[PDB]
């Protein structure tokens with residue numbers, strides 16, 4: 116695993132970083148990137164290698180500023196992922212909201228300093244997620260990890276995350292993939308190396324933050 | 332394009348079919364399959380080749396039976412896609428809700444004859460979509476097309492749909508894909524042929540339905 120300072124620097128440079136949560140939690144790795152300058156081509160890569168459910172972690176302050184209420188008032192999961200209502204970018208270049216171009220645009224607009232509620236059509240195809248106020252020390256999820264990286268790298272308080280799946284194997288001429296799953300542990304590290312990305316754990320990220328804040 | 336009767340038969344056989352809406356509308360092709368027996372391996376293929384936003388078109392009767400209210404009360408789009416609150420399957424085999432296994436399971440459970448509201452955790456990772464009562468003749472969307480195919484093929488009234496994207500080209504060692512987009516027209520047909528699938532247009536589907544119902 117890479118050291119957190121090095122992950123921060125890559126994140127500051129607008130790169131995706133690969134982040135694993137605890138094996139006792141989801142045991143999943145997500146691609147996490149700063150939303151402010153995510154490119155169409157980067158989004159296409161993200162869609163290709165992830166679940167395709169492209170989320171945008173942001174702070175409670177941003178959910179209030181942008182008027183993004185929680186999708187559900189009484190969450191099935193109490194520590195559950197805090198989905199807000201979904202969005203598309205209100206921009207002349209948006210078409211259906213699903214393309215790599217459109218999803219990247221929605222993410223950059225969510226992160227813009229002058230963002231306003233009217234900049235987003237609801238519902239849509241990008242899924243903002245409300246990080247808890249206490250950050251990664253309080254909730255050890257990828258949502259918090261993305262917002263934490265934005266803070267640590269001096270970026271706008273909106274990230275983009277999606278889970279790295281195991282697409283299994285192609286089966287020539289057949290609309291199936293054999294032995295699919297989720298990418299785990301070492302495979303996640305191998306994926307990062309293949310793509311020139313830094314890779315880390317939320318546990319190490321928490322250890323990093325604790326150097327300044329102490330244990331929660 | 333294949334003739335609608337032949338698309339119906341493939342759909343009845345549990346295959347994906349490729350369906351294009353009008354060029355003046357989204358100009359997009361979706362993979363559409365019956366939800367009732369979608370397999371883990373099929374879902375993995377769907378995720379790999381689509382946007383990854385896996386939706387489940389269903390009737391108004393099913394949204395009431397399963398207690399799936401619209402995600403938003405005052406839709407940004409008036410003829411907009413009718414997203415309900417998202418779901419995961421309440422089943423012992425579900426883990427995080429995002430894997431091909433978990434999403435396929437949620438779809439099969441939405442389609443089960445004995446489905447009940449409590450079978451679904453909200454929010455989640457599968458996106459049910461409420462088809463309009465008037466079917467494809469009333470709203471020429473993929474949501475309606477999926478429900479229409481279920482009716483035509485004698486299946487449970489729940490389909491699975493997702494847009495076929497153009498993932499662009501891989502760039503060795505770099506986390507980007509060049510020239511991504513949406514797959515269109517002839518390319519959609521080529522995609523269907525490559526994968527042994529039937530391919531059609533919503534316009535021809537409407538023409539099929541009109542043979543029995545007349546023009547709306």
Ligand SMILES: [Mn+2]
Pocket residue numbers: 136141143145256257258
């Ligand atoms: Mn996660």
Ligand SMILES: [Mn+2]
Pocket residue numbers: 352357359361472473474
């Ligand atoms: Mn569509």
